[PDB]
């Protein structure tokens, strides 16, 4: 101590006077900087980084929101976190992870049912309380033996108290958006939220077999928050990647089929009641001090073709009537390929069901169905007509994979070989393509199978299998017209990212239509599949209507399905009446934005 | 301030002070700039009397601060079933938020893993260990031991991975280093001492039931797997004259201390592939019975000898691996030559007269047929040996089968005496169902217990109480029956705690003696007052309980310490599903590496150091 100072005291007084004579007498700063530069020089920056942290005076422990970010974004249990916490605290003495109770006390801020809020005018048929979280999803549907039997389980939040917490976990993101867009921070204009709604059945959830059980989630997302300052509208907040895995928030879930129509209406009726309530109101709610006012715009878009065909009240997908957007039969599509419009709203379908029920013109079913254009049920969900982006691409992939298997067998020379040539054609196709591209033969086509197979190189491989020569022209021209056509709907913002193909798309599409109708009319002379109608005829109207096609798709809901199985398999109380509380709660906590701001700390 | 400046800027500022301190460092100390910078900066902080930063920086430069030495975070990763990438998520998040590298990165964690697996330490064998390779660093080798998968050969579709026996034995000896040093400190020997230590090692192989991960669709297939494992049970040493116990393993039939040696996805009853994969391990175990290990734990060379005991085989598998008849044999006990008739007759006096050498001799007698007898006189010439024995086993019992056999005799004794069948010897089966139904309703009405068909542990324990026989005894008249059943129940509760002791030399030495007395009294009363229970049927459990208990107690020293339900299958599924690769050839490598690394004593020390 004193003696070891006395060993090197000559340097001590030397460096001391050196620090007084030039650096003034700030001995501590120049000596610590000397130790930093002398310890970094031997490449041991770990000690220097922690020593800079201990001189800066930063705490060793963690805030409970960081601990909750760790416990949710890593899928630990609530019993293994206790293991990690107790032995970290025991080994390094000072605690770094918080205990479980201060974690759950910091959980209740981020769920629905914590904040005060009020509507103006108050909502009809909706309760006025502010502090309800997870309710039973059956909505008091009575289960006595005298009535209709039910056995499903469902949980949900309210709709308004979900939107309140979903707005106040992104308070920082709209405040920084107002700062970066040259607006005054103390503003309380009528903000408009744009909410994209999505619902998709995700069956085969069960774990054991011979009894498959299914499930249905109903979810939403925020997509654009916009204030009207002065005389213009500005995008205060915009979504980075809309159809992402972790930016759609769960709102209701149930264990039922997508086709059990009575149960599905019994659960999704109160949510549509609340949604139709909050379309003529203003939510006043504090956003950093002063209260602000929100007004919502709902677009229900993230439905696949079967769900959008069922709840909007149409005939099923194998109909004579194909388009959910227009009213033309499939025998009318193959003649006029691209000149259609969009004329299937929701209220039009509701009055057409009223026409079907009343039968006011006194005519039989064969012309009444033609008069109402195949509407034969009461539609009960307000949805906008659109096309998807995922299932469209997978459908086009399987369709010209089938045309590859057709063109191997040379049907243009002689038709109608029986169903024994075709299995050989399939075998030679996937054997050849596995030989060249190493693509394993898969029954259920995915999107990655599309991303590999939709390639000019594989076209050249099947060209090396198909005998003739002009078929290479009639196949390669088709494939590069399709590859030119794809990124106008695959893109998330094709108004600015690919504004070349988007302007050349009409010419590029009608040329494709002509090449399908001339050199391929041995398949498309009568029938045509649904997705070649949507991709060809409508998308230069959906672009000018909305913008993207890829942003308004169910890829988030389709990507979230593993989180159901994982959360249920590792984090649940195993009682089937609490078991859907916990899956919903964890899937709420996962896709918060206040927690993903911590797991991107290293990016900052 | 000078604090907030860039390191290039700070370099340009104090370049001359750096020149002066480095020139003093090589004009006085000879260029040890870090130590003199430590002294000057530490004293420049210490002069302001802020000792807290001095203690914290001392703990840093020692390394005892908030550091988490990589074995600790390896223990965290492997004992809470984290993956690899999710650990990387946790590490980069806590490092970016806190600023200091508190969790260690991946590659340092892998380098701290390689020390604990086999294939790190050098060693040698003082006799050079015939038919065993002499290299020191083989890890996981293919468990089939170079079999023939050729199509012209025998068909084989199993997957096996294993370590070598001597390599895994070296690693399991080197993993318990500090525990053996603290062992000889606690008995007050030197902390440096050459050998030889005698290492008593338990041997065990048993099945694992199912492992199928078939999500749903349809029941894909069974897929039964089985492992081969061992346990460093105790370690002794002598100092000239007297042995002394430097290590004793406290929880013997645990799950944390059963180190895996071989894993195969083969059925237990498939005999050929089982003995195919087990034969190299038996070759190495017969190799190391006559050698010496040189091992360099405390900086000095020490010598190790070994003793192997195979007590960890279940009773269905000791009758297969030693060559007895499988299940329906008249020869029931796996220690003596007693037929089922004499085991029904001579209840108490028996002695253990089976081994491995005379079993091999009896198999050769069955093969050679040296007396030209018929098949039946051959069968009672060799006392049940039909197959060729190939694993030296030392079989034993465990307490659950003992008191389950006692309860399954006592339940039928109660049903028989409750209806006075000793005077009415010819009953019909529905009358036995009637007696059973009266006993079931009366026991649920008096003791409030739901009876059941299959007999398990807690039901067999709580049925054998004094209040149970004194509650059922009022349903039978003729109080001679009451006092006789009272005497028999008192005899049973006297005979209970000897195999409920785990060390009966220290628990109950009074009841350890006169076990022959109470056992002969049990036989004399069960054949004297109950001279109607002889239906020619006696289980093997009741025989081993009544006859072969004191020979086992003098043999090993315990009863339920050298034996063995569902504890491994959950661990196998947890390691195969969460943290493993695919491809069926790396999959077994990863599950064997994790099942080795989970069961160390080093990592368990760091894990349950919270309640020290
Ligand atoms: Ca679907
Ligand atoms: Ca789906
Ligand atoms: Ca077993
Ligand atoms: Zn249309
Ligand atoms: Zn016996």
């Amino acid at each position: 101590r004193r003696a070891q100072k006395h060993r090197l005291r000559e340097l001590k007084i030397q460096v001391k006077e050196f620090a007084d004579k030039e650096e003034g007498g700030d001995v501590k700063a120049v000596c610590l900087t000397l130790f930093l530069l002398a310890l970094r020089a031997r490449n041991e920056h770990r000690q220097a980084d922690e020593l800079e942290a201990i001189m800066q005076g930063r705490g060793s422990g963690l805030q409970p929101a960081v601990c909750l970010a760790i416990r949710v974004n890593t899928f630990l249990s609530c019993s293994q976190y206790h293991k990690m916490y107790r032995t970290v605290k025991a080994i390094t003495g000072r605690q770094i992870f918080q205990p479980l109770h201060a974690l759950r006390n910091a959980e209740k801020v981020l769920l629905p049912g914590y904040h005060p809020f009020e509507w103006q005018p108050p909502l009809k048929n909706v309760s006025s309380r502010t502090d309800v979280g997870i309710i039973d999803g059956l909505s008091g549907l009575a289960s006595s033996v005298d009535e209709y039997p039910v056995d499903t389980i469902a949980k949900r939040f309210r709709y308004d108290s979900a939107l309140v917490s979903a707005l106040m976990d992104m308070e920082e993101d709209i405040l920084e958006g107002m700062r970066s867009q040259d607006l005054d921070d103390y503003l309380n204009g009528p903000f408009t939220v744009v909410v994209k709604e999505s619902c998709d059945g995700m069956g085969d959830v069960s774990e054991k077999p011979a009894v498959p059980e299914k499930a249905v989630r109903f979810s939403f997302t925020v997509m654009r928050i916009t204030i009207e300052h002065g005389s213009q509208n500005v995008k205060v907040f915009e979504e980075p990647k809309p159809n992402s895995e972790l930016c759609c928030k769960p709102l209701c879930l149930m264990l039922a089929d997508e086709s059990d129509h009575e149960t599905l209406t019994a659960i999704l009726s109160p949510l549509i009641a609340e949604r139709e309530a909050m379309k003529s109101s203003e939510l006043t709610l504090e956003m950093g001090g002063i209260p602000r006012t929100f007004k919502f715009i709902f677009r229900g878009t993230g439905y696949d073709e079967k769900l959008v065909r069922e709840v909007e009240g149409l005939e099923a997908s194998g109909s004579v009537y194909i388009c959910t957007l227009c009213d033309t039969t499939r025998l009318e599509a193959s003649q006029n390929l691209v000149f259609h419009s969009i004329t299937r709203s929701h209220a039009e379908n509701l009055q057409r069901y009223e026409v079907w029920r009343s039968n006011p013109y006194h005519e039989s079913v064969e012309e009444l169905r033609d008069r109402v254009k195949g509407v034969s049920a009461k539609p009960f969900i307000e949805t906008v007509p659109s096309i998807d982006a995922l299932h469209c691409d997978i459908g086009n992939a399987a369709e010209f994979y089938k045309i590859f298997q057709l063109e191997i067998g040379e049907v243009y020379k002689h038709p109608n070989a029986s169903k024994e040539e075709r299995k050989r054609w399939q075998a030679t196709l996937d054997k050849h393509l596995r030989k060249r591209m190493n693509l394993k033969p898969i029954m259920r086509m995915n999107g990655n199978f599309a991303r590999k197979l939709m390639t000019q190189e594989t076209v050249d491989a099947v060209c090396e299998l198909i005998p003739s020569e002009e078929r290479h022209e009639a196949l390669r021209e088709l494939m590069d017209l399709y590859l030119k056509m794809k990124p106008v709907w695959r893109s998330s913002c094709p108004a600015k990212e690919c504004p070349e193909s988007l302007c050349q798309y009409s010419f590029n599409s009608q040329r494709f239509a002509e090449l399908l109708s001339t050199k391929f009319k041995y398949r498309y002379e009568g029938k045509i599949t649904n997705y070649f109608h949507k991709t060809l005829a409508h998308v230069p109207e959906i672009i000018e209507r909305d913008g993207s096609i890829g942003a308004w798709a169910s890829e988030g809901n389709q990507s979230g399905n593993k989180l159901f199985r994982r959360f249920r398999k590792m984090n649940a109380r195993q009682s089937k009446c609490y078991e859907m509380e916990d899956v919903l709660k964890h899937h709420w906590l996962y896709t918060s934005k206040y927690l993903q701001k911590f797991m991107n700390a290293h990016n900052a």
Side-chain angles (χ1 to χ4, degrees), chain A residues 119 163-164 167-168 174 189-193 225 281-287 292-296:
Chain A
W119 293 93
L163 272 171
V164 170
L167 287 179
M168 265 181 297
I174 54 175
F191 287 109
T192 56
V193 194
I225 307 192
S281 315
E282 301 169 320
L283 164 67
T284 83
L285 166 71
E286 54 90 13
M287 210 51 95
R292 274 78 185 252
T293 73
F294 297 117
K295 287 190 300 185
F296 302 90

PDB file of all heavy atoms in Angstrom, chain A residues 119 163-164 167-168 174 189-193 225 281-287 292-296:
ATOM      1  N   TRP A 119     -64.187   7.812 -24.765  1.00  0.00           N
ATOM      2  CA  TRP A 119     -64.712   8.018 -26.102  1.00  0.00           C
ATOM      3  C   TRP A 119     -65.641   9.222 -26.133  1.00  0.00           C
ATOM      4  O   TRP A 119     -66.261   9.587 -25.136  1.00  0.00           O
ATOM      5  CB  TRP A 119     -65.459   6.781 -26.580  1.00  0.00           C
ATOM      6  CG  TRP A 119     -64.598   5.597 -26.792  1.00  0.00           C
ATOM      7  CD1 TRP A 119     -64.325   4.615 -25.898  1.00  0.00           C
ATOM      8  CD2 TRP A 119     -63.903   5.254 -27.986  1.00  0.00           C
ATOM      9  NE1 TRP A 119     -63.494   3.683 -26.457  1.00  0.00           N
ATOM     10  CE2 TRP A 119     -63.221   4.058 -27.743  1.00  0.00           C
ATOM     11  CE3 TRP A 119     -63.786   5.851 -29.237  1.00  0.00           C
ATOM     12  CZ2 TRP A 119     -62.435   3.452 -28.696  1.00  0.00           C
ATOM     13  CZ3 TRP A 119     -63.012   5.244 -30.182  1.00  0.00           C
ATOM     14  CH2 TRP A 119     -62.348   4.056 -29.911  1.00  0.00           C
ATOM     15  N   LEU A 163     -56.832  -1.511 -28.579  1.00  0.00           N
ATOM     16  CA  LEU A 163     -56.271  -0.409 -29.347  1.00  0.00           C
ATOM     17  C   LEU A 163     -55.643   0.651 -28.459  1.00  0.00           C
ATOM     18  O   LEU A 163     -54.669   1.290 -28.867  1.00  0.00           O
ATOM     19  CB  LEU A 163     -57.338   0.222 -30.226  1.00  0.00           C
ATOM     20  CG  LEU A 163     -57.443  -0.447 -31.581  1.00  0.00           C
ATOM     21  CD1 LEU A 163     -58.637   0.072 -32.312  1.00  0.00           C
ATOM     22  CD2 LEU A 163     -56.201  -0.158 -32.365  1.00  0.00           C
ATOM     23  N   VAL A 164     -56.153   0.829 -27.241  1.00  0.00           N
ATOM     24  CA  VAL A 164     -55.574   1.814 -26.328  1.00  0.00           C
ATOM     25  C   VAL A 164     -54.154   1.422 -25.930  1.00  0.00           C
ATOM     26  O   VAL A 164     -53.216   2.220 -26.048  1.00  0.00           O
ATOM     27  CB  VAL A 164     -56.479   1.997 -25.103  1.00  0.00           C
ATOM     28  CG1 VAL A 164     -55.792   2.795 -24.073  1.00  0.00           C
ATOM     29  CG2 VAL A 164     -57.718   2.737 -25.512  1.00  0.00           C
ATOM     30  N   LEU A 167     -51.771   1.536 -28.831  1.00  0.00           N
ATOM     31  CA  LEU A 167     -51.261   2.858 -29.145  1.00  0.00           C
ATOM     32  C   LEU A 167     -50.258   3.336 -28.118  1.00  0.00           C
ATOM     33  O   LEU A 167     -49.270   3.977 -28.479  1.00  0.00           O
ATOM     34  CB  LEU A 167     -52.392   3.864 -29.256  1.00  0.00           C
ATOM     35  CG  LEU A 167     -53.228   3.728 -30.509  1.00  0.00           C
ATOM     36  CD1 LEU A 167     -54.305   4.767 -30.469  1.00  0.00           C
ATOM     37  CD2 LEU A 167     -52.364   3.898 -31.724  1.00  0.00           C
ATOM     38  N   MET A 168     -50.474   3.047 -26.846  1.00  0.00           N
ATOM     39  CA  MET A 168     -49.515   3.559 -25.883  1.00  0.00           C
ATOM     40  C   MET A 168     -48.347   2.629 -25.627  1.00  0.00           C
ATOM     41  O   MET A 168     -47.606   2.859 -24.668  1.00  0.00           O
ATOM     42  CB  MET A 168     -50.176   3.883 -24.561  1.00  0.00           C
ATOM     43  CG  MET A 168     -50.570   5.318 -24.453  1.00  0.00           C
ATOM     44  SD  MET A 168     -51.293   5.532 -22.850  1.00  0.00           S
ATOM     45  CE  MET A 168     -52.652   4.441 -23.144  1.00  0.00           C
ATOM     46  N   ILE A 174     -44.407   7.563 -32.206  1.00  0.00           N
ATOM     47  CA  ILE A 174     -45.098   8.682 -32.836  1.00  0.00           C
ATOM     48  C   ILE A 174     -44.531  10.011 -32.369  1.00  0.00           C
ATOM     49  O   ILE A 174     -44.558  10.990 -33.116  1.00  0.00           O
ATOM     50  CB  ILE A 174     -46.619   8.607 -32.604  1.00  0.00           C
ATOM     51  CG1 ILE A 174     -46.957   8.491 -31.124  1.00  0.00           C
ATOM     52  CG2 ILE A 174     -47.192   7.445 -33.339  1.00  0.00           C
ATOM     53  CD1 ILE A 174     -48.441   8.544 -30.836  1.00  0.00           C
ATOM     54  N   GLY A 189     -53.881  17.193 -32.597  1.00  0.00           N
ATOM     55  CA  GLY A 189     -54.779  17.149 -33.721  1.00  0.00           C
ATOM     56  C   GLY A 189     -55.532  15.839 -33.807  1.00  0.00           C
ATOM     57  O   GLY A 189     -55.241  14.876 -33.092  1.00  0.00           O
ATOM     58  N   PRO A 190     -56.513  15.777 -34.693  1.00  0.00           N
ATOM     59  CA  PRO A 190     -57.245  14.524 -34.890  1.00  0.00           C
ATOM     60  C   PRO A 190     -56.406  13.503 -35.632  1.00  0.00           C
ATOM     61  O   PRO A 190     -56.420  13.468 -36.867  1.00  0.00           O
ATOM     62  CB  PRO A 190     -58.469  14.953 -35.705  1.00  0.00           C
ATOM     63  CG  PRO A 190     -58.070  16.211 -36.366  1.00  0.00           C
ATOM     64  CD  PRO A 190     -57.097  16.889 -35.460  1.00  0.00           C
ATOM     65  N   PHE A 191     -55.618  12.722 -34.895  1.00  0.00           N
ATOM     66  CA  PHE A 191     -54.847  11.654 -35.510  1.00  0.00           C
ATOM     67  C   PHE A 191     -55.776  10.621 -36.135  1.00  0.00           C
ATOM     68  O   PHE A 191     -56.871  10.362 -35.637  1.00  0.00           O
ATOM     69  CB  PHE A 191     -53.975  10.958 -34.473  1.00  0.00           C
ATOM     70  CG  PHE A 191     -52.797  11.751 -34.008  1.00  0.00           C
ATOM     71  CD1 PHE A 191     -52.771  12.282 -32.736  1.00  0.00           C
ATOM     72  CD2 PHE A 191     -51.695  11.923 -34.821  1.00  0.00           C
ATOM     73  CE1 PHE A 191     -51.682  12.992 -32.292  1.00  0.00           C
ATOM     74  CE2 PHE A 191     -50.602  12.626 -34.377  1.00  0.00           C
ATOM     75  CZ  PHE A 191     -50.600  13.164 -33.114  1.00  0.00           C
ATOM     76  N   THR A 192     -55.346  10.037 -37.243  1.00  0.00           N
ATOM     77  CA  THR A 192     -56.055   8.930 -37.860  1.00  0.00           C
ATOM     78  C   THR A 192     -55.148   7.717 -37.864  1.00  0.00           C
ATOM     79  O   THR A 192     -54.005   7.792 -38.328  1.00  0.00           O
ATOM     80  CB  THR A 192     -56.489   9.250 -39.282  1.00  0.00           C
ATOM     81  OG1 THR A 192     -55.346   9.640 -40.046  1.00  0.00           O
ATOM     82  CG2 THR A 192     -57.503  10.364 -39.286  1.00  0.00           C
ATOM     83  N   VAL A 193     -55.653   6.630 -37.330  1.00  0.00           N
ATOM     84  CA  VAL A 193     -54.974   5.343 -37.343  1.00  0.00           C
ATOM     85  C   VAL A 193     -55.551   4.528 -38.483  1.00  0.00           C
ATOM     86  O   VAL A 193     -56.746   4.610 -38.771  1.00  0.00           O
ATOM     87  CB  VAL A 193     -55.150   4.619 -35.996  1.00  0.00           C
ATOM     88  CG1 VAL A 193     -54.189   3.483 -35.875  1.00  0.00           C
ATOM     89  CG2 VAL A 193     -54.944   5.574 -34.870  1.00  0.00           C
ATOM     90  N   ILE A 225     -50.166   6.182 -38.962  1.00  0.00           N
ATOM     91  CA  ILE A 225     -50.737   7.179 -38.071  1.00  0.00           C
ATOM     92  C   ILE A 225     -50.455   8.545 -38.664  1.00  0.00           C
ATOM     93  O   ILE A 225     -49.289   8.887 -38.903  1.00  0.00           O
ATOM     94  CB  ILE A 225     -50.165   7.075 -36.653  1.00  0.00           C
ATOM     95  CG1 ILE A 225     -50.311   5.649 -36.140  1.00  0.00           C
ATOM     96  CG2 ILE A 225     -50.880   8.033 -35.758  1.00  0.00           C
ATOM     97  CD1 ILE A 225     -50.041   5.476 -34.666  1.00  0.00           C
ATOM     98  N   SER A 281     -66.603   7.772 -33.622  1.00  0.00           N
ATOM     99  CA  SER A 281     -66.255   8.278 -32.305  1.00  0.00           C
ATOM    100  C   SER A 281     -64.822   8.786 -32.325  1.00  0.00           C
ATOM    101  O   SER A 281     -64.086   8.597 -33.295  1.00  0.00           O
ATOM    102  CB  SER A 281     -66.433   7.200 -31.238  1.00  0.00           C
ATOM    103  OG  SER A 281     -67.654   6.506 -31.403  1.00  0.00           O
ATOM    104  N   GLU A 282     -64.431   9.442 -31.235  1.00  0.00           N
ATOM    105  CA  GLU A 282     -63.076   9.936 -31.049  1.00  0.00           C
ATOM    106  C   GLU A 282     -62.567   9.451 -29.709  1.00  0.00           C
ATOM    107  O   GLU A 282     -63.241   9.614 -28.693  1.00  0.00           O
ATOM    108  CB  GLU A 282     -63.017  11.456 -31.068  1.00  0.00           C
ATOM    109  CG  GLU A 282     -63.522  12.076 -32.331  1.00  0.00           C
ATOM    110  CD  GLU A 282     -63.687  13.565 -32.195  1.00  0.00           C
ATOM    111  OE1 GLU A 282     -64.141  14.013 -31.121  1.00  0.00           O
ATOM    112  OE2 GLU A 282     -63.365  14.287 -33.160  1.00  0.00           O
ATOM    113  N   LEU A 283     -61.385   8.864 -29.698  1.00  0.00           N
ATOM    114  CA  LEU A 283     -60.794   8.379 -28.464  1.00  0.00           C
ATOM    115  C   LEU A 283     -59.847   9.447 -27.952  1.00  0.00           C
ATOM    116  O   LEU A 283     -58.857   9.762 -28.614  1.00  0.00           O
ATOM    117  CB  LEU A 283     -60.056   7.065 -28.691  1.00  0.00           C
ATOM    118  CG  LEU A 283     -59.075   6.616 -27.619  1.00  0.00           C
ATOM    119  CD1 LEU A 283     -59.790   6.280 -26.346  1.00  0.00           C
ATOM    120  CD2 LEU A 283     -58.304   5.424 -28.108  1.00  0.00           C
ATOM    121  N   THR A 284     -60.165  10.036 -26.807  1.00  0.00           N
ATOM    122  CA  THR A 284     -59.272  10.996 -26.186  1.00  0.00           C
ATOM    123  C   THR A 284     -58.496  10.277 -25.100  1.00  0.00           C
ATOM    124  O   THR A 284     -59.073   9.506 -24.310  1.00  0.00           O
ATOM    125  CB  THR A 284     -60.010  12.196 -25.604  1.00  0.00           C
ATOM    126  OG1 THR A 284     -60.502  11.862 -24.307  1.00  0.00           O
ATOM    127  CG2 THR A 284     -61.163  12.606 -26.497  1.00  0.00           C
ATOM    128  N   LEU A 285     -57.194  10.546 -25.070  1.00  0.00           N
ATOM    129  CA  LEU A 285     -56.232   9.731 -24.347  1.00  0.00           C
ATOM    130  C   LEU A 285     -54.929  10.501 -24.280  1.00  0.00           C
ATOM    131  O   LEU A 285     -54.520  11.084 -25.282  1.00  0.00           O
ATOM    132  CB  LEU A 285     -56.029   8.410 -25.072  1.00  0.00           C
ATOM    133  CG  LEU A 285     -54.834   7.601 -24.625  1.00  0.00           C
ATOM    134  CD1 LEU A 285     -55.165   7.087 -23.268  1.00  0.00           C
ATOM    135  CD2 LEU A 285     -54.582   6.486 -25.592  1.00  0.00           C
ATOM    136  N   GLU A 286     -54.286  10.523 -23.115  1.00  0.00           N
ATOM    137  CA  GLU A 286     -53.060  11.295 -22.993  1.00  0.00           C
ATOM    138  C   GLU A 286     -51.915  10.607 -23.725  1.00  0.00           C
ATOM    139  O   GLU A 286     -51.778   9.383 -23.694  1.00  0.00           O
ATOM    140  CB  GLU A 286     -52.709  11.523 -21.525  1.00  0.00           C
ATOM    141  CG  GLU A 286     -52.620  10.277 -20.686  1.00  0.00           C
ATOM    142  CD  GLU A 286     -51.226   9.688 -20.670  1.00  0.00           C
ATOM    143  OE1 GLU A 286     -50.285  10.382 -21.110  1.00  0.00           O
ATOM    144  OE2 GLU A 286     -51.074   8.528 -20.237  1.00  0.00           O
ATOM    145  N   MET A 287     -51.098  11.403 -24.408  1.00  0.00           N
ATOM    146  CA  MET A 287     -49.911  10.913 -25.103  1.00  0.00           C
ATOM    147  C   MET A 287     -48.751  11.817 -24.711  1.00  0.00           C
ATOM    148  O   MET A 287     -48.432  12.776 -25.418  1.00  0.00           O
ATOM    149  CB  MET A 287     -50.124  10.885 -26.602  1.00  0.00           C
ATOM    150  CG  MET A 287     -49.329   9.807 -27.278  1.00  0.00           C
ATOM    151  SD  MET A 287     -49.607   8.246 -26.447  1.00  0.00           S
ATOM    152  CE  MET A 287     -50.908   7.553 -27.442  1.00  0.00           C
ATOM    153  N   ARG A 292     -54.551  13.671 -26.436  1.00  0.00           N
ATOM    154  CA  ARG A 292     -54.658  13.681 -27.883  1.00  0.00           C
ATOM    155  C   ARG A 292     -55.905  12.903 -28.280  1.00  0.00           C
ATOM    156  O   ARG A 292     -56.468  12.140 -27.484  1.00  0.00           O
ATOM    157  CB  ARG A 292     -53.418  13.068 -28.547  1.00  0.00           C
ATOM    158  CG  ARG A 292     -52.260  14.023 -28.769  1.00  0.00           C
ATOM    159  CD  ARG A 292     -51.473  14.292 -27.496  1.00  0.00           C
ATOM    160  NE  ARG A 292     -50.437  15.302 -27.687  1.00  0.00           N
ATOM    161  CZ  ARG A 292     -49.135  15.044 -27.730  1.00  0.00           C
ATOM    162  NH1 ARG A 292     -48.701  13.806 -27.568  1.00  0.00           N
ATOM    163  NH2 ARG A 292     -48.268  16.028 -27.918  1.00  0.00           N
ATOM    164  N   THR A 293     -56.339  13.108 -29.523  1.00  0.00           N
ATOM    165  CA  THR A 293     -57.571  12.520 -30.033  1.00  0.00           C
ATOM    166  C   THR A 293     -57.273  11.641 -31.234  1.00  0.00           C
ATOM    167  O   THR A 293     -56.599  12.073 -32.176  1.00  0.00           O
ATOM    168  CB  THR A 293     -58.576  13.586 -30.449  1.00  0.00           C
ATOM    169  OG1 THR A 293     -58.135  14.186 -31.670  1.00  0.00           O
ATOM    170  CG2 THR A 293     -58.716  14.650 -29.383  1.00  0.00           C
ATOM    171  N   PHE A 294     -57.818  10.432 -31.209  1.00  0.00           N
ATOM    172  CA  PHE A 294     -57.620   9.434 -32.243  1.00  0.00           C
ATOM    173  C   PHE A 294     -58.939   9.098 -32.920  1.00  0.00           C
ATOM    174  O   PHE A 294     -59.986   9.030 -32.274  1.00  0.00           O
ATOM    175  CB  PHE A 294     -57.025   8.165 -31.657  1.00  0.00           C
ATOM    176  CG  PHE A 294     -55.672   8.354 -31.060  1.00  0.00           C
ATOM    177  CD1 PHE A 294     -55.457   8.145 -29.712  1.00  0.00           C
ATOM    178  CD2 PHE A 294     -54.612   8.718 -31.853  1.00  0.00           C
ATOM    179  CE1 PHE A 294     -54.214   8.310 -29.174  1.00  0.00           C
ATOM    180  CE2 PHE A 294     -53.370   8.890 -31.325  1.00  0.00           C
ATOM    181  CZ  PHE A 294     -53.170   8.685 -29.984  1.00  0.00           C
ATOM    182  N   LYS A 295     -58.870   8.885 -34.232  1.00  0.00           N
ATOM    183  CA  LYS A 295     -59.981   8.406 -35.032  1.00  0.00           C
ATOM    184  C   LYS A 295     -59.460   7.329 -35.968  1.00  0.00           C
ATOM    185  O   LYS A 295     -58.379   7.453 -36.550  1.00  0.00           O
ATOM    186  CB  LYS A 295     -60.637   9.532 -35.825  1.00  0.00           C
ATOM    187  CG  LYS A 295     -61.459  10.466 -34.968  1.00  0.00           C
ATOM    188  CD  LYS A 295     -62.279  11.423 -35.807  1.00  0.00           C
ATOM    189  CE  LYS A 295     -61.387  12.279 -36.677  1.00  0.00           C
ATOM    190  NZ  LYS A 295     -62.166  13.297 -37.425  1.00  0.00           N
ATOM    191  N   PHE A 296     -60.242   6.268 -36.114  1.00  0.00           N
ATOM    192  CA  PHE A 296     -59.750   5.028 -36.685  1.00  0.00           C
ATOM    193  C   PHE A 296     -60.346   4.791 -38.059  1.00  0.00           C
ATOM    194  O   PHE A 296     -61.463   5.212 -38.358  1.00  0.00           O
ATOM    195  CB  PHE A 296     -60.077   3.840 -35.789  1.00  0.00           C
ATOM    196  CG  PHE A 296     -59.532   3.961 -34.409  1.00  0.00           C
ATOM    197  CD1 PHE A 296     -60.266   4.561 -33.410  1.00  0.00           C
ATOM    198  CD2 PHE A 296     -58.290   3.463 -34.107  1.00  0.00           C
ATOM    199  CE1 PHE A 296     -59.762   4.672 -32.147  1.00  0.00           C
ATOM    200  CE2 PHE A 296     -57.786   3.571 -32.839  1.00  0.00           C
ATOM    201  CZ  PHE A 296     -58.523   4.175 -31.861  1.00  0.00           C
TER     202      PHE A 296
END
